[PDB]
Amino acid sequence: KKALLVVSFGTSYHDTCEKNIVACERDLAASCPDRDLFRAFTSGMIIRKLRQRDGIDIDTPLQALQKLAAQGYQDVAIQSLHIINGDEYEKIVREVQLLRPLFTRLTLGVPLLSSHNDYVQLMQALRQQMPSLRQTEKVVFMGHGASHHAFAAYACLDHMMTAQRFPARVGAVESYPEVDILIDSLRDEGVTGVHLMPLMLVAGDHAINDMASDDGDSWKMRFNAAGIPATPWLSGLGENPAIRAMFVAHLHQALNM
């Protein structure tokens, strides 16, 4: 009796959830034909909202594993759908370690950016969702998170793209790298237009409001005011099959360790 537990931050937006979370959940479940698929969200705020508005009861990672032990699952494999290997992920690391004694085997895969090779692979994956570019055009990715794990990861990715001349740049909403610096920089280089894409699992309010909207504080209005027309592409990273494949590869690395 084996289980597969897929852990996300969460979203209360059904459509982007279905397109990213569920799509990742499905591929992960499908690569484990002998496991039952279970879900857990981490964000209390999202859990409460789905409960009050939809009647949906989403377990936390602690509630999910306790219910799995009560159902007789002795071996549970867990994959978290995080981009950053940081604070959210370490919280799941602790909770898994705590509840380990309830099971014969508990295994946990790691977030997207957890080694040099993940950065390499993630940049290959991102290249698959980028539209055809004019040479004065670039794609601009919008990350989220101000922790030191998150912004260093965004900077590093920007550092690698720039060095290798990948036709994209990475910024982080209200974090680093800063989009105003990026805008200045792209303007001084002669950038003609940009494609804004979320560097996030799902397209939530950050992507809808801060990245793509018509509010004057959005990244696309600020690119436009700098004379660099911006076209928003509201899709989470879960919609990209190359990213879903990285999640799968991480689940199987953990199982194989």
- CA distances, 199 to each of 21, 71, 236 (Å): 14, 37, 7
Nearest CA to 197 out of 241, 160, 144 is that of 144
Per annotation, catalytic residue among 14, 82, 116, 144: 144
Shared domain for 118 and 69, answered yes or no, is no
The CATH number of the domain holding residue 104 is 3.40.50.1400
Shared domain for 226 and 242, answered yes or no, is no
Shared domain for 69 and 178, answered yes or no, is no
Shared domain for 102 and 204, answered yes or no, is no
- CA distances, 244 to each of 26, 30, 249 (Å): 10, 12, 9
181 in a known ligand binding site: no
Shared domain for 33 and 74, answered yes or no, is yes
Shared domain for 1 and 108, answered yes or no, is yes
Question: Rounded distance, CA 185 to CA 168, Å?
Answer: 13
Helix (H, G, I), strand (E, B) or coil at 107: strand
Question: Rounded distance, CA 219 to CA 216, Å?
Answer: 8
Helix (H, G, I), strand (E, B) or coil at 36: strand
Confirm if 27 and 20 have CB atoms less than 8 A apart.
no
Shared domain for 102 and 166, answered yes or no, is no
Q: What is the distance between the terminal CA atoms of the chain, rounded to a whole angstrom?
A: 20
Question: Rounded distance, CA 54 to CA 48, Å?
Answer: 10
91 in a known ligand binding site: yes
User: What domain range is 200 assigned to?
Assistant: 113-235
Method: X-ray
Q: Beginning with the edge strand found earlier in the chain, give each strand of the sheet holding 137-143 in spatial order.
A: 168-172, 137-143, 193-198, 230-232
Instruction: Tell me the β-bridge partners of 3.
Output: 36, 76
- Cis-peptide into 101, omega within 30 deg: no
Residue with tokens 């370490």: 90
Shared domain for 107 and 172, answered yes or no, is no
The greatest distance separating any two alpha carbons of the chain, rounded to the nearest whole angstrom, comes to 61
195 in a known ligand binding site: no
Shared domain for 43 and 84, answered yes or no, is yes
* Nominal resolution (angstroms): 2.4
Q: Which two tokens stand for residue 171?
A: 């910024």
47 in a known ligand binding site: no
171 in a known ligand binding site: no
Shared domain for 167 and 156, answered yes or no, is yes
Question: Rounded distance, CA 196 to CA 186, Å?
Answer: 13
Domain tally, the chain: 2
Helix (H, G, I), strand (E, B) or coil at 11: coil
Shared domain for 153 and 183, answered yes or no, is yes
| Residue 82: active-site member | no
Shared domain for 131 and 176, answered yes or no, is yes
Confirm if 247 and 27 have CB atoms less than 8 A apart.
yes
76 in a known ligand binding site: no
88 in a known ligand binding site: yes
- Position 120, amino acid: V
